[PDB]
Symmetry: C3
Subunit: 426 residues, 3 copies
Amino acid sequence: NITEEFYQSTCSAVSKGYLSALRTGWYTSVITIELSNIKKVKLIKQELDKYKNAVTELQLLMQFLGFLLSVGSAIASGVAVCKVLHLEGEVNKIKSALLSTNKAVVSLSNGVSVLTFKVLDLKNYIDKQLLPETVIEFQQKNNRLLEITREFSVNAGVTTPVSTYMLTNSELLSLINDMPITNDQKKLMSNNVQIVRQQSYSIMCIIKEEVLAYVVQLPLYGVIDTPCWKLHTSPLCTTNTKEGSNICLTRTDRGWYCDNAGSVSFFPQAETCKVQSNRVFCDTMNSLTLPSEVNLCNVDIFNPKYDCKIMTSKTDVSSSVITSLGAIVSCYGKTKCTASNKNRGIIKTFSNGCDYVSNKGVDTVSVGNTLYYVNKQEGKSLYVKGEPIINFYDPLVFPSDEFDASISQVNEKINQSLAFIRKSDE
Amino acid sequence: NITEEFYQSTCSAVSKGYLSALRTGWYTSVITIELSNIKKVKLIKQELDKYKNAVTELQLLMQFLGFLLSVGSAIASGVAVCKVLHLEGEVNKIKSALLSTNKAVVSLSNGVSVLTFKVLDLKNYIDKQLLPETVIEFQQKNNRLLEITREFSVNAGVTTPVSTYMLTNSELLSLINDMPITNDQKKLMSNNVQIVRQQSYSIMCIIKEEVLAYVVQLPLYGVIDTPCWKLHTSPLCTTNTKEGSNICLTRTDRGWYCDNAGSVSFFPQAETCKVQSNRVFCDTMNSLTLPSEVNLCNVDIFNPKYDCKIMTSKTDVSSSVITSLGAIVSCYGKTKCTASNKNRGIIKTFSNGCDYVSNKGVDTVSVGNTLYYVNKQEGKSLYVKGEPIINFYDPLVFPSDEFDASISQVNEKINQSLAFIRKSDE
Amino acid sequence: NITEEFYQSTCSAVSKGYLSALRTGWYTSVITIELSNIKKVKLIKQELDKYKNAVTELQLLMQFLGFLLSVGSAIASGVAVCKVLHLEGEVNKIKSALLSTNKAVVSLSNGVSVLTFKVLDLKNYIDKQLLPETVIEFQQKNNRLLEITREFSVNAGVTTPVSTYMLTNSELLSLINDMPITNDQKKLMSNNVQIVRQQSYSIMCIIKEEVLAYVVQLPLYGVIDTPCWKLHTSPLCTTNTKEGSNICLTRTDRGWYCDNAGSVSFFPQAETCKVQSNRVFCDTMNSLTLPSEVNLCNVDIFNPKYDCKIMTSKTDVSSSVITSLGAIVSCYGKTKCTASNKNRGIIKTFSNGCDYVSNKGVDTVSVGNTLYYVNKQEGKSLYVKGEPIINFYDPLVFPSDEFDASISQVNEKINQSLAFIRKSDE
Ligand SMILES: Cc1ccc(O)c(Cn2c(NC3CCN(CCN)CC3)nc3c(C)cccc32)n1
């Protein structure tokens, strides 16, 4: 199932065996709550005043390679719907369709078909029972309105993750079933609703004509079940005796990779992706589209089809990288890097250089004064032995500070340092 | 109103037409809640014990160019007030002035005039009605105390945004009216209270002599209605056939710019600023003070009055930048960059290079495997055609990795690469 | 007590006098809540249905030198315990020991001794009193279950800081006393429980056999009361008349330093550390282990025992750094940098260069259009006058863009710029 390979030659590891679940687009839906414009006998007297204060508040409300990523507007789609609800009659168009039912699709003015929902009916409640047991239904239906108000006030009207007050599980699962997507998307979203909530936006919209409206921006997973893999990289330095004469090298192309429509979506920020079992939930807005030949950098970093990105330095500090099925340890200098078991203690001492250890039998990794716990996910690891490529470079002609560089950029910068020695032969 | 210009020569865009609302200073106010030191008939028995537990908890509580920004202490002003409240008698000085009223100004010991507030009076409530209808007022007045306690415990005593429990809308708006500032500030803060909350701090202070105190740090908007504009920049690379031989260039001076007292405040992190309609709420602590000649970089990047900051690389990856009134697309390589309408599909395919499209008629922008929604704010855009300045450079003498550089730094580094060729003429 | 020294020669300051409280390891504990599998008289009718909905939800739930830091898995230890609770019989092993008591240690299958806790007993409550005063105990015991559910749903099952619903103060303090650590750790954690909460994780685990379980990951403070100090650095540029001909220099080794087992733990991100009085709560996962000779860079930056890290540029923009006992001001160009008192106004105007001022007598620092408040902590400051080291460099042979560099890297790069002039003598 989940496997992992470590490349001693490049001091990197690839955790493959995952499945994709990428957000490609958005789905907007207008959630409405009908309100009553109002102006045992004493319990409602103080609970109805919370209603007058929530409406009072809501009216005051409306009235390494990460630097290469694009800069988009996340809620640009949802706000594009709220500018339509501000139009005259566009509110009554929704209030008319949501008359005899709570779920109805309303074709808006600008050719936008939105799935509207009437999740709460306070107008039909305050005007039917609160005109001079039922205090329970009021104190509970009003409590949800207060909670929607609290989230929209301490967030300037944009909520994420979408809480159960903006959309209950019964409303959300019913909204997932009714929205028109494939059967694979419907069950993927239904089995991981808390992930859909974290990738969803609740946008305060308008209060007009006894109605509170707010758009719930939901993710569309156009890419499902395609192979994904996470690349872990660590510095690869030399281990010479005299400190300072050491040169380093680090693959900067680390992050989440997923096959996507002939190309490969690369997420340089592994926190934009979320792993549930072997499923990887990412957001394409934080991605880069790369040719599928980018995977060649793991096996052969010197391949001619893709220029693998690296960074160079002389800072040979020790660091560890907890991988999906093990840990990469870059031990340099006088650092004490060990790998220990829970009930037995230290089982391996890392020699100077970049080494690797699997989580099978290892519980913690110690580098210096820091203790790192390894992930105990079951999986098979593989150690691909090889000569560290940092030994292939001459330290005297090695560029000591390149960050947005690659294998070829370093090689093409070394060769014209060897043009200066064509004058040295005088 | 809101306009935008795109510069093809520099692959950048300027969204002008905004108004300023910058936080220049702070305003401290001590919010107090009087407590009763205590030690239908059974409802209060379990509600009064929440009071004993909240007080028990609170006693345990107290007892690109972003790297150029300054490093300040945000709550340095508010904490400077809490060290004054710990002084002996300084608590009783407040408890004495807040005797017959809830709002009173207390001149503190170190020459600090603070606007004190008694938002809740539990001592006057527990000692007047809870000694052996009113269970409502207790269960609601005590519920606010519990909520103030919950926020101060899960935040180590510092709360932002200031919730309605720390300061209700009635208390906040009354605190805004009573604080001594100009009439323009009072209405700006009163119409955007949820923005003031997000720029405010609630700092737990002290519990001494039956009183709970906490300072609410409020923003002062010394700069209002001055012109602001947001600069969007994208990489500008060459489109040669052989990949790798391409050189790139990107204006690093992007962010929010606002005219401010002869100079211009520059916010390199556009997330420190918040846009409501055409108003821009920024925080000067995340700003840089630049000469007003910085705006010359948009029209002429080679102007002699200001050295426009750029960064160079050979990484010609495709990226898009969703602007205020459109989108900038930097399409390089085999990437499929398109701009589509909602109900009609693709309307433009971007050729290789840096192009631009306005939101009038365009709903989405596709670059690679990513879909970006454009902001649908109404405004007039302008395409300033011009020769891309990256064509003016020779790739063989082009510095391939400069980040904290400028136009002159590149030109002064190219010329001494042309001193090496004065030896080449042998 | 708390002191501070400013180094004019290197434009840096060291705030010493602190004590350490570093998280070295974790402590896992399984928190359990027994549930009843169910399927004045009408109050429970709607409160018991919240119980059926919380269980319904939870079942859907489960079923500068910062780039040198390591990459670990924070909850790798806690999740390693939840994979053990999913084993058959491992749930009943816990449900058996927590029979006659609420606190009991359960030795798990994989040789893991965990301190289990039964914080809530709803099975013993619903099955003892809710089969056809007590509505109070139900509406309050059920309200905690709802709050644990709300946090676990809007956070995908991982909560931090651990709220009082996951673990009350009575349960937490009792869990701190019963866990086996030294007496110094027990009182350190008991006096700063809100800090322990912010460094703790609440991980949703399993619902099986009428039991809800979730692991609370607690910090272990293996390093206590060792000396700590925070290094503040600011750019140090030249003040030549013609702008652009100026060279800059900045010590990149800023952050929190703490003596730790012969070495020194360095935290380049000062936000990973938390200061309470003179105690510094850090997390070693965001640390680097450096030789104790790193402190030599403050007194003599040119010392031969450690290569002090610096960065160079030509960007002479003005910036300020609010220190622990004062403020560092780097005033360059036409910027107006002042230091003012509260009741008297400007008391010092900063000349061009890097200067410093103590908080004794100063309340604010103004640099450009920004107002910075100084921290008013009582302490003695010291101004170590010295020649700024930037004057020791020739601007014509000064590397204008080095970030991951040091004193020796610059000196070894200057000398081979002086090899090019051995050809200039022709
Ligand atoms: C080694 C390293 C590690 C992490 C880090 O954030 C940086 C900072 N940094 C540099 N490096 C500068 C400039 C280029 N080089 C200049 C050689 N003449 C080296 C010093 N280029 C950057 C780019 C392009 C984007 C974002 C950050 C960049 N460098």
